[PDB]
Symmetry: D2
Subunit: 248 residues, 4 copies
C-alpha cells in the first residue's frame, strides 16, 4: 500500500521519457494512483512514451491555449474513469517560452507577443486548468504545478523566470478558489533537470544535487498529492537539494 | 540646495493631481530637478493637469503598448533636453488591468487576453521603457517603478497582483541591463493611495489621502543617497508589510 | 505498510497530552515508527502521558541546557534501541520563553537573562540535539523541529518570535552539517494550536489571531486538531520529501500565503 | 546645504577609521548634523580616531552589555546635546561574536555562553538602545541598524548569521514601540566591507561592489536618517549592489 492508494490523478507534461511529467506519472502509479494522462501536440509520439510507464492510462489531448479543449476537458476525464468518479489529484507540469525571450537572446530583444504566449502556457494555464477541473475533484484533493526558484535573477532563464514569478502569484489565487472544494494548491520548485549553475547547485545543496535524476522531484509531488501534507496550500515546497537556502 | 539638483528626470504616469506620478514630479522640481513627462490617452486634458506642477515641463506623448512611441522616445527626449544632455532618472508609474480581472469579478472568468493586456502594460512595460531610455541615460542614473506588494494573495487586486509579481521579477532583470550603464533599477511598494486596517498594522500609521511620503521615497531612489541598492524593492507602506497583526 | 515503517525515530517535547509532540508520536506509531522519547523535568509525570500513546516506548531525560545530558544522549539512545541500531529520525518539539519576554509584558522589559534562556532552549537546542544524535543516524535520515513563522512582528509572541527567527537560521546551518551524514534538516511552521487567563487584552488579542487564521487559510484552519501538523512532520521523517533540507514546510492552512 | 542639516543624531560602533560607523559619522557631519558618539572599551583610541572627523564631537562611553551605561544613557546624552533638546536619529552599528562562533571553528562546538554574548551585543542591544534613547527622541526621528543578509546560510559568518536573523526579528518589534514616538526603525543590510577583521559579491552585483569602500553604506544609513524615506519602518534596505537579488 503506497502513498496514493485509491487515487485518480491527472498528469500533464509527458513529452519525453526524460520529462518530469514522466517520472511523476511513473512514481504515482508505482504507489497506487490510477492515472489519467494528457498531451499537447505530438499525440501519437507521447502515446508511445506513456506505454513505457509501469501501467497504461487514458491519455488525453490538452493544448492549454485552446478554449474548446478546456471546455470539453472535464467531461472527457469523466468518460475515462467512469461517471460518478471524481479526481483526487491534478498535476500541471507544463512550460513554454519561445527562444526569443529565453536562453542566449538579450532580455530586451523579446517582443511581448512572444512573452505573452510564454506566460499564457506557463502561468495563466495554471488557473485555467484548475477552472476546468475543480468541479470534477474530491475534497481533500491536491493540485500541484512545477516551479523553478524565480525570486532572484540569473543568466539565460530571462522571461521564463518572469513566468514562474507569475505562476507563484497565480498559485496563491488558485488556492483561494480551490479551498471551496476542500482542494489544496501547491508548487514544487525543483532543481535543474536534464531535459556553471549546475556545478554550483550541487555545491550549495547540503545533500547534493544530481541533475540526471528526476525521481527525487517526483517523490515530492506524490507527497503533495498524498494526505500527509493536509494543511499546506497556496505554497511552494522546494526540491532543489536545499540549494535555495544556501548562499555559498 | 535640492536632493535631485541638476539631474534631468523622466516622469510618466500622470493623469490627475491625486496620481502618484504627479506628486513625484512636484517634489522633484521642488528638489531643483529639470523634468520630462509622458502621457497616455487623454493627452490634451492632462496638459491642464501638468500646468499646476510648479515649473513648465515638456509633456511628450508615450503609450507603452505602442511600438512607435517607444522607438521615437529617446529622440523625442534628447531633443526636449537639447542634444548633448542625457537623463539621470526614469520613473514608471503605470498600471492597467481590465475590470474582468479584478474586484468581485471571479478569478477564473478573466480571459487571458484581458490579463495579457494587463501584464504588457503593468509588468512588461517596465522593461520596454528601460530598453528605450538606457541609451540616453548618464552613469549614476536611477530607474524606478511603482509596486504593490504581491507576496501574498488578497481580495480585489486579483490579476494585478500577478502583474505586480511579474513586475518584481522583470525589475531584477532590468537591473542587470542598467548595470551595464552604471544605472540602478528599483521598485517602490506603495501603500494605498486614493485614486483603516493599513493605518492599524502600520506602526507609524498610514494616510491614503497623502501621496507625498511615497513621492518623497521615489525621490530618494533618484538621489545619489542609495548608490548601492539595485534590482530591489523599498516599501513606502508605513511598515505594514512587516507586521502580522 | 505504514508511512514510517521500521524507522527508529527520537521524539522530544511531550509534556501534556495536548503537546504537538504527543500527536507527532501518536501518528508516527500508527504509521509503524519505533520510538525513543526524551522528557524534560517532571520525568515521572510524563511517563504517565507516554503510557497513553498507541504504544509504550522508552523515556529518556533531556534537559537541553545540560551539557552532560547531550554527551550521554547518543549512548543512552543506542542502548535503548539496541547496539547495532541507529535513528532514522529526530523531532525537536522543544520551546521555552519566560512570561517576561512573552505575553502582555512590554517588549523592552524582558531582561536579557530571560531572553537568553529562551534562545538557548528554543533555537540553540536544535544545533545541540543535532550535534548529539547525528553520529548515530542512518543516511537518508531526517531532523525536524517546530517553528511559528517569525517573518512579521505581532502581539504577545514578543521574544519567542526572535527565538523562532534564530531557529530558522540555526536550521539552515544544521542542514549543512547533517548533509555530510546524508541527513536532511527541516522545520515545520504550524498554525496556532490549543497548547483569558492572561486578561481582557490577551483573551481578545489572542481571540483575534484564531479568528484571523481560519479566515485567511484558504482551506480553513482548526485550532483544536494538531493531527495535520503531526502528519506534516511524518512526511519530513519519510522518504517522500528527500530533496528538501534547510527549509520550512508550512502546515498552517496556507494562511501565511494570504493577506486577508 | 545638507541632507541632515541641524539634526541631533547619535552613532555607536567606531573602533578604527575603517569602521562603518566612522563613515556614517563622517557623511552625517558632511551633511550638517550634530553628532554624539558612543564607544565600547578602547575609549582613549576612539578618542584619537574621532579627532580626525569633519567636526569635533562628544564621545560618551557605552558597553551595551552594561545595565548602568544604558540606565544612564539618556541623561548623559541630554547633557552633551544640552537641556530642552532631543535626538533626531540613532545609529546602532554594534556587533560582535567570539572566535568560537565563527570561521574555521565547527558550528557545533560553539558553547551557548559564547553564542549568547554575541546575540546580546549584536541582536538584543538594539532593543536596549531603542529603549534607552526613545524617551529622548523627537517625532519624525529615525533609528537604524547594520545588518548582513542572514536569509540563507553561508560558511564562516556562522553564528553571527543567527545573531543577524535575530536582529531583523528584533527590528520589526522595535518599530512597534518606535511608532508611538512617531519614529522609524530600520536596518541597512550591507555587502562585505574591509573592516579591521570584518569576491562573488562584485560579480553578482549588477552595479558591482567594492568592499574596501564603505561610503555607499553610510550614504544609505544617512538616507534612512533623512526625511526622504519617511514611509519606511521595521524594514531592511539592502546596500549591497543588488547582489542578494541575483543568483549568478
Ligand atoms: N527540467 C528542469 O530543469 C526544470 C526545473 C524546474 C522546473 N521545471 C518546470 O517543470 C515543468 C515540466 O517541464 P520539463 O522540465 O519536464 O520539460 P518538458 O519539455 O519535458 O515538459 C514541458 C511540457 O510542457 C508542455 N506544453 C508546452 N505547451 C503546452 C500547451 N500549450 N499545452 C499543454 N502542454 C504544453 C510540453 O508539451 C511538455 O510536455 C515545466 O513547467 C518547467 O518550467 C523544469
Ligand atoms: N494608488 C495605489 O494605492 C498604488 C499603490 C501601489 C502601487 N501603485 C502603482 O502606481 C502606479 C500609478 O497608479 P496611480 O495610483 O497613480 O493611479 P493613476 O490613475 O493616477 O495612474 C495610472 C496610470 O496608468 C497609465 N496607463 C494605463 N495604460 C497605459 C498605456 N497603455 N500606456 C501608457 N500609460 C498607461 C495611465 O495613463 C495612468 O497615468 C500604478 O502602476 C499602480 O499599480 C498604486
Ligand atoms: N501551540 C502552537 O500554536 C504552536 C505553534 C507553532 C509552534 N509551536 C511549537 O511547538 C513546540 C512545542 O510546542 P507545544 O505547543 O507542543 O507546547 P508544549 O508546552 O506542550 O511543549 C514545549 C516543550 O518544551 C519542553 N522544554 C522546555 N524546556 C526544556 C528544556 N530546557 N529541555 C528540554 N525540553 C524543554 C517542555 O518540556 C515541553 O514539552 C514549540 O517549539 C513551539 O514553539 C507551537
Ligand atoms: N564589514 C562587514 O562585512 C559587514 C557587513 C554587514 C554588516 N556589518 C555590521 O556592521 C556593524 C559594525 O561593524 P563594522 O563592519 O564597522 O566592523 P567594526 O569592527 O569596526 O565594528 C564593530 C563595533 O561593535 C562594537 N562593540 C563590540 N562589543 C560592544 C559592546 N559590548 N558594546 C558596544 N559596542 C560593542 C565595537 O566596539 C565596534 O565599534 C556590525 O553590526 C556588523 O555586523 C558588517
Amino acid at each position: 500500500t503506497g502513498l496514493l492508494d485509491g487515487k485518480r490523478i491527472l498528469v500533464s507534461g509527458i513529452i519525453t521519457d526524460s520529462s518530469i511529467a514522466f517520472h511523476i506519472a511513473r512514481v504515482a502509479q508505482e504507489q497506487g494512483a490510477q492515472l489519467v494522462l494528457t498531451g499537447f501536440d505530438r499525440l501519437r509520439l507521447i502515446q508511445r512514451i506513456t506505454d513505457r510507464l509501469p501501467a497504461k492510462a487514458p491519455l488525453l489531448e490538452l493544448d492549454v491555449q485552446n478554449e474548446e479543449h478546456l471546455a470539453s476537458l472535464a467531461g472527457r476525464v469523466t468518460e475515462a474513469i467512469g461517471a460518478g468518479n471524481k479526481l483526487d489529484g491534478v498535476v500541471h507540469s507544463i512550460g513554454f517560452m519561445p527562444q526569443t525571450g529565453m536562453g542566449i537572446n538579450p532580455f530586451f530583444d523579446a517582443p511581448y507577443a512572444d512573452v505573452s504566449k510564454g506566460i499564457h502556457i506557463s502561468a495563466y494555464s495554471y488557473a485555467s486548468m484548475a477552472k476546468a477541473l475543480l468541479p470534477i475533484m474530491n475534497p481533500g484533493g491536491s493540485i500541484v504545478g512545477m516551479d523553478f526558484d524565480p525570486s532572484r535573477a540569473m543568466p539565460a532563464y530571462n522571461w521564463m523566470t518572469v513566468a514562474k514569478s507569475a505562476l507563484e502569484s497565480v498559485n496563491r489565487f488558485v488556492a483561494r478558489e480551490a479551498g471551496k472544494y476542500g482542494v489544496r494548491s501547491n508548487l514544487v520548485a525543483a532543481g535543474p533537470i536534464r531535459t556553471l549553475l549546475e556545478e554550483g547547485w550541487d555545491q550549495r545543496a547540503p545533500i547534493g544535487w544530481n541533475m540526471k535524476d528526476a525521481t527525487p522531484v517526483a517523490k515530492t509531488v506524490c507527497a503533495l498529492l498524498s494526505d500527509w501534507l493536509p494543511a499546506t496550500t497556496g505554497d511552494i515546497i522546494y526540491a532543489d537539494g536545499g540549494a535555495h537556502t544556501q548562499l555559498l
